[PDB]
């Protein structure tokens, strides 16, 4: 399974960006999808996830109320609308896919497929 | 880590038997306290099997007498289903809960699709 991210770039604090990620295959709706981020000199961290089937959404506490994850299963696409952006959100953002259902979505080892990432820079 | 090792899909013959692998590497300090197998009913995972401190429990009537879960080896909680019906086709979730010495619990799950053939 191949994952390809779109979107990203430079935005002012308080602004917003939409990231998207497209997946190959024909069983997309049965995979849980996630977004992770990594800043220079820091380890990669969980951002958001959306479950298979019913699509329950999960967010890192520091992005709750600012980021929204969603999916279009007929398009094999997951989206991340990042609003209310802050300089601390500057990082490379990665989409990932796994077969977890309700648990373990914050654990990177639970995702078997990864994109190469897209850079997001928030300037004050 | 930890993660569960479960294939994306398995097949079983109509009226025959099937094994749904669910394995993991035991970790020092992670004591297994709960094992569940669930069947996906739309948006709702529905527990069909529960292993707790009181033993094994079959939680949906249609699996009574047709369901076994491995227990002899630490880290192998694979599910076996016998006399497969076409109506057994579904997504099944293996879910294991561990408890650490400090009382914290860690939960992992993974989904397989069971297809019934012939």
**Cβ–Cβ < 8 Å for A9, A92:** no
How many residues are listed for chain B in this entry? Answer: 118
How close B7 comes to chain A (CA, Å)? 9
What's the Cα-to-Cα distance from A90 to each of A70, A122, B28, rounded to whole Å? 21, 5, 37
Token reading at A43: 């380890």
Burial class (CB within 10 angstroms; exposed 0-12, middle 13-18, buried 19+) of B89: middle
Let me know how many helices (H) and strands (E) chain B has, helices first. Answer: 0, 9
How close B80 comes to chain A (CA, Å)? 20
A103-A107-A109-A113 Cα dihedral, nearest 10 degrees: 80
Cα separation of B60 and B81, whole Å? Answer: 13
Experimental method: X-ray
Residue B65, SS3 per DSSP: coil
Phi-psi region of A106 (alpha: psi -120 to 50; beta: other; left: phi over 0): alpha
Measure CB to CB from residue B3 to each of A52, A102, A110 and give the nearest one: A110
What was the resolution (in A) of this experimentally determined structure?
A: 1.5
Cα separation of A104 and B1, whole Å? Answer: 9
Q: Supply φ then ψ for residue B105, to 5 degrees.
A: -110, 145
Measure CB to CB from residue B111 to each of A54, A99, A109 and give the nearest one: A99
* Residue that has been written with the tokens 């609003």 in this structure: A83
Burial class (CB within 10 angstroms; exposed 0-12, middle 13-18, buried 19+) of B6: buried
Token reading at B97: 């809960």
Query: Which residues of chain A are within 8 Å of residue B38 when distances are taken between CB atoms?
Result: 101
Measure CB to CB from residue A99 to each of B44, B45, B110 and give the nearest one: B110
Q: Biggest alpha carbon distance in chain A?
A: 42
- A99–B1 CB contact, under 8 Å: no
Cα separation of B118 and B101, whole Å? Answer: 48
Q: Are strands B31-41 and B44-52 parallel, antiparallel or unpaired?
A: antiparallel
| Residue (of A81, A72, A87) closest to A33 by Cα position | A72
- B113–A104 CB contact, under 8 Å: no
- Cis peptide bond prior to B2, omega within 30° of 0: yes
- B108–A100 CB contact, under 8 Å: yes
* Residue that has been written with the tokens 């820079």 in this structure: A121
B78 touches chain A (CB under 8 A): no
| Residue (of A61, A53, A58) closest to A30 by Cα position | A53
**Cβ–Cβ < 8 Å for B108, B95:** yes
What's the Cα-to-Cα distance from A31 to each of A1, B10, B69, rounded to whole Å? 11, 16, 24
Cβ contacts below 8 Å, chain A against chain B, sum to 50
**H/E/C letters for each residue in A15-73?**
CCEEEEEEECCCCHHHCEEEEEEECCCCCCEEEEEECCCCCCEEECHHHCCCEEEEEEH
Query: Which residues of chain B are within 8 Å of residue A26 when distances are taken between CB atoms?
Result: none
């Amino acid at each position: 399974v191949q994952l390809v991210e779109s979107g990203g770039g430079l935005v002012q604090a308080g602004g917003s960006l939409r990231l998207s990620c497209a997946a190959s295959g024909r069983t997309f709706s049965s995979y849980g999808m996630g977004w992770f981020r990594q800043a220079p000199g820091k380890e990669r961290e969980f951002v958001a996830a959306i479950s298979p089937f019913g699509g329950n959404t999960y967010y890192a506490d520091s992005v709750k109320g600012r980021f929204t994850i969603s999916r279009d299963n007929a398009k094999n696409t997951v989206y991340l609308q990042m609003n209310s952006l802050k300089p601390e959100d500057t990082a490379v953002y990665y989409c990932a896919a796994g077969r977890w259902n309700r648990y373990g979505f914050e654990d990177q080892d639970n995702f078997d497929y990864w994109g190469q990432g897209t850079q997001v820079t928030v300037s004050s | 880590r930890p993660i569960l090792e479960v294939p994306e899909s398995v097949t079983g013959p109509w009226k025959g038997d099937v094994n749904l692998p669910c394995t993991y590497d035991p970790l020092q300090g992670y004591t297994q306290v709960l094992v569940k197998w669930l069947v996906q009913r739309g948006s709702d995972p529905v527990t069909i099997f529960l292993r707790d401190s009181s033993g094994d429990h079959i939680q949906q009537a249609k699996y009574q007498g047709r369901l076994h879960v491995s227990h002899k080896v630490p880290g192998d909680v694979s599910l076996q289903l016998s006399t497969l019906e076409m109506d057994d086709r579904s997504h099944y979730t293996c879910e294991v809960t561990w408890q650490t010495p400090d009382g914290n619990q860690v939960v992992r799950d993974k989904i397989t699709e069971l297809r019934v053939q012939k």
